[PDB]
């Protein structure tokens, strides 16, 4: 009632801004079971449900997001220099599909602003991480950058020391040429540079490095990414970003808007990409599963397919804050029904049957 009112009155971008403000001010029951704890990426996670990148692009609402019940928070994407992103309108709801299309184009306050914001709460975060509530930082590249690898390297040096993990986002559909960085040769060069930069940070400031990939890759592209990840010792994968596909059956009036599609229509394309990447990496590379999670069943499907952790965003825009607790409670119930001792036991379970 209260959320749909404000959202019917506001365009989606305005609603997003209000949600970030409300969350940041802490204007918002479930106590996490031991069954939901996961140890991965060199950290304890109190529960495996995180907020996906894009909700808190500029690191303004981190503490409010933990208050909402997320086991981990990812901020970004952050670009080196501030930039405005694409012209409006750039976000569209597809209510009949429980989906969103966005073409933000990496609107970002930039590394310096975000650095200072995170520094203001750096020791608070250190305590939260120790308590099982880690922080990830997702890095992008500026529109007019002439050297993509140097943009990512700048991000590692500036925000790496404030993050438990960093994400090399090479899968936004809304920056020209970006997804080409997922190609074997480009990815290997880029990731070598990123990992060199990371390894140069002092030990207590040295994050894990993950790569976030698209749902629209060819089988060759996926095989290539798996090979590079193993070759270089990349710490994990985030699977997946939004899709440039438009699955048959979309009903929303705005289905043919340009941008990345998220929410329910992405769900099974993302799950199958998790499944493939888990197999190609022999289950040895942690995966954060994302795309269309709005229930415990959705979360458990991704975990059984190979995800160690999951994230959501689009479900929050339809169902609000209560969806977080709902996913967690449902996931715990399913784990019990299916005879798992906890989340850890379920990771990759479909591959072992
Ligand atoms: C409005 C919006 C903005 C997004 N911005 C980013 C971003 O800056 N960086 C990123 O890696 N992913 C971004 N994403 C992608 C999401 O993190 C997530 O991969 C995708 O939306 C699928 O999850 P969902 O179906 O639960 O929303 C964005 C998604 C939405 C809906
Ligand atoms: C895709 C841009 C967008 C749009 C939107 O209504 N929301 N809503 C959220 S969180 C849900 C929420 C909505 C409102 Cl209006 C106020 C508080 C909260 Cl938590 N994030 C959003 N992001
Ligand atoms: O800024 C955006 O347009 C954005 C980035 C990204 O990685 N994914 C997405 O769907 N939108
Ligand atoms: Cl520091």
> From the coordinates shown, what is the CATH architecture?
Alpha-Beta Barrel
Amino- and carboxy-terminal Cα gap: 44 Å
Strand content: 15-25%
Which bin fits the share of residues in helices?
Answer: 25-40%
Instruction: Provide the structure class.
Output: alpha/beta
Secondary-structure element pattern, one letter each: HHEEEHEEEHHEHEHEHEEHEHEHHH
Question: Number of helical segments?
Answer: 13
Main beta-sheet annotation: 8 strands, parallel, barrel
How many domain modules? 1
For this structure, what is the CATH homologous superfamily? Aldolase class I
User: In angstroms, what is the radius of gyration?
Assistant: 19 Å
The level 1 CATH classification is Alpha Beta
PDB class: oxidoreductase
Keywords: oxidoreductase
Assembly: monomeric
Entry title: Structure of Human Dihydroorotate Dehydrogenase with a Bound Inhibitor
Give a verbal description of the structure:
- Helix 7 runs parallel beside helix 8 and helix 9 runs parallel beside helix 10.
- This protein has a single domain, classed as TIM Barrel (Alpha-Beta Barrel).
- The chain starts with a helix and ends in a 7-residue tail after the last helix.
- It is globular, with a radius of gyration of 19 Å.
- The protein is α/β, with parallel strands linked by helices and 353 residues long.
- It is built from 13 helices and 13 strands.
- The strands form 3 sheets. An 8-stranded parallel β-barrel has the order 3-4-7-8-9-10-12-13, surrounded by 5 helices. The chain has a 3-stranded antiparallel sheet with strand order 5-6-11, with no helix packed on it. A two-stranded antiparallel ribbon has the order 1-2.
- The structure holds flavin mononucleotide, ligand KFZ, orotic acid (ORO) and chloride ion (CL).
- The site of chloride ion has 2 residues, from loops.
- Pfam families: DHO_dh.
């Amino acid at each position: 009632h209260l959320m749909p009112t404000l959202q019917g009155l506001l365009d989606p971008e305005s609603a997003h801004r209000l949600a970030v403000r409300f969350t940041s001010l802490g204007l918002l029951r479930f106590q996490d079971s031991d069954m939901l704890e996961v140890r991965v990426l060199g950290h304890k996670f109190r529960n495996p449900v995180g907020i996906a990148a894009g909700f808190d692009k500029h690191g303004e609402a981190v503490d409010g997001l933990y208050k909402m019940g997320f086991g981990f928070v990812e901020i970004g994407s952050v670009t080196p220099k501030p930039q405005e992103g694409n012209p409006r309108p750039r976000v569209f709801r597809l209510p009949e599909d429980q989906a969103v299309i966005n073409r933000y184009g990496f609107n970002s306050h930039g590394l310096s602003v975000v650095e200072h914001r995170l520094r203001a709460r750096q020791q608070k975060q250190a305590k939260l991480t120790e308590d099982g509530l880690p922080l990830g930082v997702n890095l992008g590249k500026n529109k007019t950058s002439v050297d993509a690898a140097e943009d990512y390297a700048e991000g590692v040096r500036v925000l790496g020391p404030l993050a438990d993990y960093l994400v090399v986002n090479v899968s936004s559909p809304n920056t020209a040429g970006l997804r080409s960085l997922q190609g074997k040769a480009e990815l290997r060069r880029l990731l070598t540079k990123v990992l060199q930069e990371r390894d140069g940070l002092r030990r207590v400031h040295r994050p894990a490095v993950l790569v976030k990939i698209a749902p629209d890759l060819t089988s060759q592209d996926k095989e290539d990414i798996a090979s590079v990840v193993k070759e270089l010792g990349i710490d994990g994968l985030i699977v997946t970003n939004t899709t440039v596909s438009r699955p048959a059956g979309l009903q929303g009036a705005l289905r043919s808007e340009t941008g990345g599609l998220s929410g329910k229509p992405l769900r099974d394309l993302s799950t199958q990409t998790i499944r493939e990447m888990y197999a190609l990496t022999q289950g040895r590379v942690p995966i954060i599963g994302v795309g269309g999670v709005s229930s415990g069943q959705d979360a458990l499907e991704k975990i059984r397919a190979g995800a160690s952790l999951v994230q959501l965003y689009t479900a929050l825009t339809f169902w609000g804050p209560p969806v977080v607790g709902k996913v967690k409670r449902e996931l715990e119930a399913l784990l019990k029904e299916q005879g798992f001792g906890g989340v850890t036991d379920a990771i990759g379970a479909d591959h072992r049957r």
